[PDB]
Predict the structure.
Amino acid sequence: MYLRPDEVARVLEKAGFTVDVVTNKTYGYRRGENYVYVNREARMGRTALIIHPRLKDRSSSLADPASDIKTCDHYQNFPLYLGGETHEHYGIPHGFSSRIALERYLNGLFGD
């Protein structure tokens, strides 16, 4: 099945990451200037891996998105959507169904 938020965070730990922001809704994760957010709301591991804007087309070339943009309450990301009544941040929902693929994903997009 798809990788649950538990598993996503676990892989990030192994990859030499650090915690950016911890909440009951998400595990904000960072390694240097690389920021991602483990969507703990992912009852289905399809929207479990939130990364960051900028990498939208690039990231999708390594792994397809589960949506497009997810309006964040906790995950700042920076680009805080001003084009609305309520200004909520937005991250890009990704997801997998192979733990090793997430490893190779971090390998590609954030590693080599």
